[PDB]
Design a protein around this ligand. Structure first.
Ligand SMILES: C#CCNC(=O)[C@@H](NC(=O)[C@H](CCCCNC(=S)CCCC(=O)O)NC(=O)c1ccc(C2(C(F)(F)F)N=N2)cc1)c1ccc(O)cc1
Ligand SMILES: [Zn+2]
Length: 267
């Protein structure tokens, strides 16, 4: 694929509807642990070990400790220059009648924190809960999310399970429910919400330029979104620290941290 910033910016100057797909690399550049690839371990595990319905069924306390840790670390994390360039682009183009929408794989809300408004969080959020009894989805920023998790979630190998009884894990506050909450995060083996897929597809089907930023293009179905756009004939530019299995489907590839390349690309 082309690495001509000038040719990319010619498309950018005329694009009326830009889709920006983002993944864990953008979060890693803010120091967010992503628990995938080089993104870290929590105790002896990575995300694919704990972000599953079976893990939560068998050890909901351990899975809650993991997500508790990740919630609490966010207080010290800020959007990076990549997030900011993306948010600034949306704002600037929006005044010109031009649409920018972010479709993110990330669950850390840093695009929101940066001021992105047109945002599809296709895997949910660290800061939402879903009740396993009544299905209600709620925003939750409480620190700690429940008292039993105070001081828990420590990430060092050999840390013992808190083994919090399910009654003392986060519980639904809807009147008359009281069910056990789970993170409102899409886990491996679970499909994405059909309403979110419909919203994704509406943007993919109408965009005239697509950027795929900081993603390894190995998590499906998200990894197929930018290839679908390219197959429609629309230019796709990949901004990533390395090539990926999807790179050769795209019109452009710009190697480097997104905080380095995106401020120039989206100026
Ligand atoms: C990493 C990696 C690669 N794994 C994958 O891509 C797998 N994908 C998956 O498993 C994804 C979900 C991925 C969620 C990722 N969540 C993240 S990144 C949020 C943060 C998690 C955290 O950090 O805590 N799900 C699916 O791909 C999926 C698709 C269809 C169904 C379905 C059908 F009927 F529609 F076909 N049966 N109902 C179910 C699941 C996968 C595995 C095998 C397959 O054949 C297809 C997909
Ligand atoms: Zn409930």
């Amino acid at each position: 694929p082309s690495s001509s910033m000038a040719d990319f910016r010619k498309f950018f100057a005329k694009a009326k509807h830009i889709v920006i797909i983002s993944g864990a690399g953008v979060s890693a550049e803010s120091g967010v642990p992503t628990f995938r690839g080089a993104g870290g371990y929590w105790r002896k595990w990575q995300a694919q070990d704990l972000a599953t319905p079976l893990a939560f069924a068998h050890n909901p306390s351990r899975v809650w400790e993991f997500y508790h840790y990740r919630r609490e670390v966010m207080g010290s994390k800020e959007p990076n220059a990549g997030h900011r360039a993306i948010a600034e682009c949306e704002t600037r183009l929006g005044k010109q009648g031009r649409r920018v929408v972010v479709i993110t794989q990330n669950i850390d809300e840093l695009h929101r924190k940066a001021g992105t408004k047109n945002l599809l969080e296709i895997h949910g959020s660290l800061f939402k809960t879903r009740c396993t009894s009544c299905g209600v989805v709620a925003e939750n920023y409480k620190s700690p999310i429940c008292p039993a998790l105070s001081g828990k979630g420590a990430p060092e190998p050999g840390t013992q399970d808190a083994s919090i009884p399910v009654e003392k894990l986060p519980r639904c506050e809807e009147a008359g429910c009281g069910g056990l909450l789970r993170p409102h995060v899409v886990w491996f083996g679970e499909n994405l919400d059909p309403a979110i897929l419909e919203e994704v597809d509406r943007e993919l089907a109408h965009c005239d330029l697509c950027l795929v930023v900081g993603t390894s293009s190995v998590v499906y179905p998200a990894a197929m979104f930018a290839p679908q756009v390219a197959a429609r004939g629309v230019p796709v530019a990949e901004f990533n620290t390395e090539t990926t299995p999807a790179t050769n489907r795209f019109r452009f590839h710009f190697q480097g941290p997104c905080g380095t390349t995106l401020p120039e690309a989206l100026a």
